[PDB]
Symmetry: none
Subunit: 289 residues, 4 copies
């Protein structure tokens, strides 16, 4: 009344806010705003209290969400169950990937898939660590060690993290020969490489947990700070090729190795996988890197 406005209302409640819902459903905030307002205007009832930060349900809001959500869910669930069996070389694949590395590793592959399959659309959702329920997703990309899960997992690669510094910084601060000396250096750390675990040739492991001169939630900005000679950082070698090439960044502590992090493609057990998802999985497999 309308059912889809009511179902959009359900989504808003589960994601906590309009912006959060927009990011997860890929629906513009302006459209969510409008449809929720239309619903309230049809009911003559305010379902949500909007004053930030927290969105809260009115008495009517609680009543609708409590009673109607279960059925709405079973409906969306039952529909998917049918569309998953039917067809087809068309549709939209919903993908979750780690915020970092997707740009330089995944996108080339994703772009290639959309070229081979112009009728298959992609909704890419990137969240760092993501911690998220697998069932709201067609395919999941994770980095590093995992645990059941029990989803179908396949190693599609691995990333090697190395320590680097600009020559400008190194001329000022003589480079360390032991990982323990890092405490005497300006360190630059970006998520999720905040806790450095390094092992050398003698089987000696040192763990650096310093907060660093510069700590960021993403690695690109840290990489930048490093180029400007603000200290030493730990970064995926794949992000360093260009700078190692031109020598603006140089590797340090080469005897000290950080354990390579495996790249995984995860997906749900179905026995009935939609053609769109089957096509995607097999494409990623045959793809290199």
């Amino acid at each position: 009344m309308k059912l889809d406005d009511l179902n959009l209302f359900r989504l808003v409640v589960e994601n906590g806010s309009y912006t959060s819902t927009s990011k997860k459903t890929m629906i513009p905030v302006a459209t969510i705003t409008r449809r929720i307002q239309a619903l309230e205007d049809s009911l003559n009832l305010r379902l949500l209290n909007r004053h930030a930060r927290k969105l809260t349900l009115t008495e009517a809001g609680e009543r609708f969400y409590k009673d109607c959500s279960p059925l709405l869910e079973r409906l969306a669930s039952m529909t998917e169950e049918i569309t998953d069996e039917c067809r087809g070389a068309s549709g939209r694949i919903r993908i979750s990937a780690p915020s970092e590395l997707t740009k330089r590793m995944m996108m080339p592959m994703f772009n290639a898939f959309m070229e081979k399959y112009p009728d298959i659309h992609i909704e890419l959702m990137m969240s760092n660590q993501a911690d998220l329920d697998p069932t709201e997703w067609d395919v999941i990309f994770r980095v590093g060690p995992q645990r059941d899960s029990s989803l179908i997992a396949r190693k599609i690669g691995e990333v090697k993290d190395i320590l680097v510094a600009s020559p400008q910084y190194l001329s000022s601060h003589p480079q360390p020969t032991h990982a323990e000396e890092l405490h005497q250096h300006q360190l630059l750390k970006g998520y999720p490489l905040l806790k450095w675990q390094l092992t050398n040739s003698q089987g000696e492991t040192v763990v650096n947990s310093d907060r660093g001169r510069f700590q960021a939630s993403a690695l690109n900005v840290v990489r930048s700070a490093c180029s400007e000679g603000l200290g030493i950082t730990l970064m995926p070698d794949v992000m360093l090729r260009e700078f190692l090439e031109d020598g603006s960044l140089v590797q340090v502590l080469s005897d000290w190795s950080s354990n390579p992090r495996d790249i995984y493609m995860l997906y749900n057990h179905k026995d009935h996988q939609p053609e769109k998802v089957r096509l995607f999985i097999d494409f990623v497999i045959g793809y290199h890197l």
Copy 2:
């Protein structure tokens, strides 16, 4: 999905055809066509043959088998909730100032409840909010503004704080002429009236900050102490009506006034307000004092 289109597909299967369904729903046949077509588009699946007796495809039979029952419960369920939620009967949550309510609000509340025996009231009282979160209340009564929300604010009354004492106290204690002489008297003070800021006829403003012989977190007990001739207090005019009229308490320093305090009513626009709350709001508005 849309769900409303899936629901339309249901009514169509029930009624027997577009025209049949168009007559019962007043939905233009061409509309039903467009919307059923957009549904088959989203699914990339043909649900029924639009070519003359309408027949459901294997996918059509599937969708109607599983979804129709849920669509139906949901349809009646949403009907029931709205009927109750915007109905006149039901419980109402109200916040009012403690200590001033019994004398001012209760007659208004009692009258309301008598007029509307099916509307029930839950009344929380506080001297401290102000602070409390509005999303938990249908209507809020407070002293002074605001501060500051989207809540519609209506000034429905005012209180005038006056100084009183018993004939007995004034027998052994010479009545004060100037408010500065309050320093030589036994003062009875109660929250929220602790800092006495008194202005007289000539514009002279004196402030009494003395802790006072007796201090309570509520005025009503400070009132009894005053009747026992224990000293002078500052209290709302309405709480003193009878005692002033029976002689128990006599007013002093009548020319020394504090700033009047307005009583406001707070609520969200009646537009999207349940009939329960609308009736209470209007009743209060149509009420004297």
Copy 3:
């Protein structure tokens, strides 16, 4: 600095709100805002984050509280136990009491005390559960058990709760002849008497947890509603006495009885204890009430 401003800052933090601190310190929210602002202006540092109704502590705030709080506490405790021994029998007694029954029951006694001991002043706070720092109070009155704590406890009375309604109401609603029939009546309930537990002489107990036609956080406004013939309520007999007297309210199901609620006086053990506090305790123990 001022040091009193700092101490107030501490008091605010420990309560975790401006409003809360206002009713607890007998200082208006406005004066509190003024002084906290003064403190931050003299420091040129922001201690609290206010705009957010949560009221958080900033880096500087966290630091000032952590390091100065212990000294402030010891200081306030020290100047207390110095003016305790050197002074007397004058001074102020901080008293905690229930909002429910104080006015009707304690005030006559409290008034009599202040009349007998003019130089002894009283700071009285009615409790909603603080809950509940004993060392902040000179004397504490509560209703019911137990708690129990390390406090010294004297039972000084009790209250019996009865069911009443106006003749007007009973005229159109014949009084109930069994506790169970309350489910069929308009009920008016006030804190802390929302859950009615009634017992007859035959051992039978019935519990009424109905939300009620009218539910309030205090009993006085409920009494008012009951007088307008709005229904049946459960209330301390001491608050109903003169209304039973004039027949404006009438008891029903005296057949059934609610558990009497004990009234206690609680105080921290100390020797020799401040003279002002001995006088009060002694006065109460020998005082005639219900």
Copy 4:
């Protein structure tokens, strides 16, 4: 309280007289006399014989000084110690900035700041939803669009124009759109927050595109790469595009159709009530402007 009068009392004892205390603290002799008496009146006790003409403490006086003065002393040393650390030009600061724009628009500045101040460390967090964050967790907040109002001081540091781009290769097989309305016939690549496209021409006509793109992402970056791969048209900040137009990997289309420009704000509490640590950052940004 008043702790400050008690503290003044302490000073007097240590100085030996009102006048030597006035000379020390610059507080007028009449003021000292008035505040000491005011203290004595709140205690109803005498601490001093000011007429003695030679410092003489009462029994209460000796008691208060001996037990309290040491506490006051540590309190003064401590508040001075703490305000000294908050006025230090070092320490860590928490900064929040926009997901996509920080790298392009603000990192050069942050880098420059850290070079200038090696003892000030930066904790940087990027997010898409500037309204969903708690301002009390951050020293400085950079965000797109005006602040969901708070007590923060706001400062516009820049802005971004969102333009439409495609790769030359995409245009090889897809003739360029000459009207924003023709976008429905093209492949669109969209990324939050730019999902609903609202475009206005030089005549004030506004067209809105809410189509679901063949590719949609939670961030604009990966959208750019898809555009470079020739997968369609996208709407993106010019600051994220300029260098790709310049290297020839992208071209602008429908340039006469402008999108509502978005301002970059810098939010902070109050430069005065801020620890030197954070004030140096705010002033650095303000004058930078290089």
